C-alpha cells in the first residue's frame, strides 16, 4: 500500500504473477507528480520528449510512489536535475547526458551560455512543504523482453508432481499444453529441453 | 457547452435522438479528472478494476464535467471515498459496500 500509480502496457498486472520472460530491465528516476503521465508510450510532454521516451510497441509496467521523506531537504533540493531543452526528441530508450549549451534562437552559443543560450539541465527544488503537483516521486519502469530463447524470468508458483499416465494440462518452463506424458527410448540432445 | 467529456461507445450521439430503447440506466459518481479516462470499456486501472467496471458489450454514453466549484472545500472535502484494495477484480456492473 505504497504505490500511487501502477500501470501495464502489453500485459495485465493481475495475470503477471504467473508469466515467464527472457529478461526484464528496470529504469529508475525521480520526477514530479504531474510528470507521471508523461511516462507512457505515445504520450507527449517535456519529460516524454527530452528525458524519457518509450516505443509505440513498448511492453512493460510503470510504478510510482511518493519519495519526499528521503529525497527532500528543508532548504530545497538541487541534487536532482532534468533536461529542459533538446535539439530533437529522444529516440526510444535513449539516454543523454550531454551538457552542451542549447540555442533557442539565432545567436550561436559557441560553447558559452548567453541570451537564448542556456544550460540544458534544470534543477527541481524539492521542499518538504512543496505542493503535491511538484512533490518528488520515485518511479521504476519494468520493461519486459521475450525472445526465441529459453525464458530465465519465472514466477514463484510451486511445481506439481508428475502425473504421468493420465490426461493432464502441463506447463514445463512456460511451455504449456494438454496431453498425456509417458517415457520413451527417445535419446535427446543433451543440452536443450524439449 | 457544459460538459468537458462526452464519449459515446457503440452508438453515435448525433443519431441518438432517433433511437428507441428498452430502458436506460444512468450511473453517477465523482472522480478526479485525471482518472476520467478510466471510465471506458476495456480499460485497466484501480478505479475500473475495483469500483466501476463496464462490459465489453457496453452500448452507451459517458459524460464527465468539472465540479470544483460544487464539490470542493477550503479545508478539504473528504465526503467522497473510493475502494483501494479488493480480494479479486470487480465484475461488470457490480457494487460492494
Amino acid at each position: 500500500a505504497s504505490f500511487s500509480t501502477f500501470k501495464c502496457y502489453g500485459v495485465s498486472p493481475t495475470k503477471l504473477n504467473d508469466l515467464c520472460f527472457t529478461n526484464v530491465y528496470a529504469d529508475s528516476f525521480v520526477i514530479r507528480g504531474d510528470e507521471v503521465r508523461q511516462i507512457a508510450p505515445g504520450q507527449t510532454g517535456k519529460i516524454a520528449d527530452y528525458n524519457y521516451k518509450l516505443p509505440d510497441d513498448f511492453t512493460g509496467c510503470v510504478i510510482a510512489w511518493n519519495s519526499n521523506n528521503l529525497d527532500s531537504k528543508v532548504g530545497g533540493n538541487y541534487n536532482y536535475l532534468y533536461r529542459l531543452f533538446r535539439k530533437s526528441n529522444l529516440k526510444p530508450f535513449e539516454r543523454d547526458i550531454s551538457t552542451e549549451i542549447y540555442q533557442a534562437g539565432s545567436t550561436p552559443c559557441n560553447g558559452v551560455e548567453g541570451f537564448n543560450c542556456y544550460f540544458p539541465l534544470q534543477s527541481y527544488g524539492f521542499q518538504p512543504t512543496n505542493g503535491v503537483g511538484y512533490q518528488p516521486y520515485r518511479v521504476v519502469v519494468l520493461s519486459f523482453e521475450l525472445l526465441h530463447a529459453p525464458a530465465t524470468v519465472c514466477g514463484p508458483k510451486k511445481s506439481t508432481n508428475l502425473v504421468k499416465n493420465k490426461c493432464v494440462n502441463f506447463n514445463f518452463n512456460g511451455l504449456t499444453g494438454t496431453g498425456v506424458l509417458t517415457e520413451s527410448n527417445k535419446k535427446f540432445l543433451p543440452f536443450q529441453q524439449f | 457547452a457544459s460538459f468537458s467529456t462526452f464519449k459515446c461507445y457503440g452508438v453515435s450521439p448525433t443519431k441518438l435522438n432517433d433511437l428507441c430503447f428498452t430502458n436506460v440506466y444512468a450511473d453517477s459518481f465523482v472522480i478526479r479528472g485525471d482518472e476520467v479516462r478510466q471510465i471506458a470499456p476495456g480499460q485497466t486501472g484501480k478505479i475500473a478494476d475495483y469500483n466501476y467496471k463496464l462490459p465489453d458489450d457496453f452500448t452507451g454514453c459517458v459524460i464527465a464535467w468539472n465540479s470544483n466549484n460544487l464539490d470542493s472545500k477550503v479545508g478539504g472535502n473528504y465526503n467522497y471515498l473510493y475502494r483501494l484494495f479488493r480480494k479479486s477484480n470487480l465484475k461488470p456492473f457490480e457494487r460492494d459496500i
Partner: antibody
Amino acid sequence: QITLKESGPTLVKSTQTLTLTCTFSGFSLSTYGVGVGWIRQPPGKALEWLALIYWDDDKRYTPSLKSRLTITKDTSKNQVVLTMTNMDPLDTATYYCAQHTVPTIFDYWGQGTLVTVSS
Amino acid sequence: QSALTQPASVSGSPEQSITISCSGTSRDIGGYNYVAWYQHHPGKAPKLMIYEVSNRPSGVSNRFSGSKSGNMASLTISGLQAEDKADYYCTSYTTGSTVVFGGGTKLTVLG
C-alpha cells in the same frame, strides 16, 4: 547506541569569535539521509534553530544569521566545528547539536553547552 | 500567525486521559501535513512523540495520539503517571522554508 557530546569553553567575550566542537560516535556522517545541525535556547524562551549540514556537504543556514554562522566538518575526525562572529551579550544561552533526518527533526540531541557573552 | 498555539499548562488526575490542544492556521497546520508534538522533561533534552499527524512514536508508549483537525491538533495523552510531569511543544513546517515551534506547555499530575 548513538552517542553525542559537545566541547569548548563556556565563557565568551563580546565581539570575539565563538568556537564550539560537537563530537559524535556510533555512526558515520557520510551516510545518505544523515546530517548534523545546531540549535540554541535562551532561558525562558523557545529554542532558536541556527543551521545544519547534510551528508553531502550542502550546508544550509537560517536567513537571519547567515552572515554570522559558519560550520566545518570532517567524517574522519568524528566531530564538527561551529563558529560565530561578533558575539553579543544576548547570545547567552544553551547550545545543542543533533542529528538531522527529515521528518524526525533532530531525532537525537546532545547534552548541550552553557554559553555566556560578557566582558 | 507564524507561530503555533499552546496553552499555559495542563494537569489531571492520575491514570486519567486528557488532551493538549495546539492551534494555528491552514497555512501551516491542518491544511498541511508534517505537524509534530514534543515532550520536554525540564533540564533534559526533549524527545519526539508525534511526528506527522497522529502516528505512534518511534520508540515510546502508545498512550499518546494526534488529531487531524482542519486547523487544530490534539495530543491525547492517557494514563497519567509521575514520570509524565513535563513541558510540551508544538512544531510544524512553515509555508516558507522555515520551521517554527509553539508557545510551550506545562503538564503535572496533581500530586
